[PDB]
Amino acid sequence: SQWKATFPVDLEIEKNSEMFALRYIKCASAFILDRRGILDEKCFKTRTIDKLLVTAFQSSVPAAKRVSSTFDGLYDAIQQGYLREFAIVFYKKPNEEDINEVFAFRFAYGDEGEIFVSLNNGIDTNESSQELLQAKFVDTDNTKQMFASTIKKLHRCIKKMEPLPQGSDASFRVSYTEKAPKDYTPEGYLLSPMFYTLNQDIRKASIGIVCGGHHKIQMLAASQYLKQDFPNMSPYGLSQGI
């Protein structure tokens, strides 16, 4: 039930920061997929992290084990400094380009300096990239508190969303840093020329940035199901694992 049952401590250390970064995106993904109704409810279990009720995959369920396992190849992508963004996108087949909702996790490594703002795809903006640059590691306890604050804000955002359309589809999409080789593909993902693009008028929400010592992870959302821009108290990649 304590932090250390789920996440590393001593987050200033590179290996602990890496492991935290991967476990964090997996944790938030389970929270999101459960609350938005993507998989059957038996794919999830509620767990406790300090004062918060969070969600985990139930790996004894095949569909959950499949989704959980997609994260394994992202660990090497994070270790090598190759993962720039992990995004969960919701759409309706057959139109895989028409993104109704996205939850994006953008990474900054060490003190990278500045990061290119994409002009034609994604969710990032000049403002979001400035916020990611300005965020800084402070200490492990502070990251415990910022995790809690961020999950609470994610919960409040999702409470303001209308339900996904019946039978929505979901995919995981990833983009890479300039260090990654030209045809880089994490295990479990497929190489794709396509990422995702959003409509100019979609409503957006900035949920928060959590930091390990060597990794900063920014969560940004966009949805047609938010009305306006926005208890749990105790060279791209594609995965169609969902």
Author numbering: 19 to 248, 258 to 261, 278 to 285
Task: Kindly provide excerpts from the paper associated with this entry.
HORMADs were named after the first proteins in this family to be discovered in budding yeast: Hop1, Rev7, and Mad2 and meiotic HORMADs are essential to organize meiotic chromosomes for the meiosis-specific events of homolog pairing, synapsis, and recombination. Meiotic HORMAD proteins have a characteristic N-terminal HORMA domain that allows HORMADs to adopt two different conformations: a closed conformation and an open/unlocked conformation. In the closed conformation, a peptide on a binding partner called the “closure motif” binds the core of the HORMAD’s HORMA domain. This interaction is stabilized by a C-terminal region of the HORMA domain called the safety belt, which wraps around the HORMAD to lock the binding partner’s closure motif against the HORMA domain core.
Using CRISPR/Cas9 gene editing, we made a corresponding missense mutation to the htp-3H96Y allele in him-3, where arginine 93 was replaced with a tyrosine (him-3R93Y). While the closure motif for HTP-3 is unknown, HIM-3 is known to bind closure motifs found within the C-terminal tail of HTP-3. We cloned and expressed wildtype HIM-3 and HIM-3R93Y in E. coli, purified each protein, and performed a fluorescence polarization peptide binding assay to test how well HIM-3R93Y binds a peptide encoding HTP-3 closure motif #4 in vitro. Consistent with prior work, we found that wildtype HIM-3 binds the HTP-3 closure motif with a Kd of 220 +/- 20 nM and found that it does not bind to a control peptide with a scrambled sequence. HIM-3R93Y binds to the same closure motif with an increased Kd of 690 +/- 130 nM, indicating that HIM-3R93Y binds the HTP-3 closure motif with reduced affinity compared to wildtype HIM-3. The thermal stability of HIM-3R93Y is similar to that of wild-type HIM-3, and a crystal structure of HIM-3R93Y in the closed conformation is equivalent to that of wildtype HIM-3, suggesting that reduced affinity for the closure motif for HIM-3R93Y is not due to instability of the protein or an inability to adopt the closed conformation. These results demonstrate that HIM-3R93Y binds the HTP-3 closure motif less readily than wildtype HIM-3, which would potentially limit its ability to adopt the closed conformation in vivo. Right panels show the position of residue 93 and show that the overall HORMA domain structure is not impacted upon mutation of arginine 93 to tyrosine. Similar to pch-2 single mutants, we found that there was an increase of nuclei with 5 GFP::COSA-1 foci in him-3R93Y mutants compared to wildtype controls (10%, p value = 0.0004 by two-tailed Fisher’s exact test), showing that mutation of this residue in HIM-3 causes a loss of crossover assurance. Therefore, him-3R93Y suppresses the defect in crossover assurance observed in pch-2 mutants.
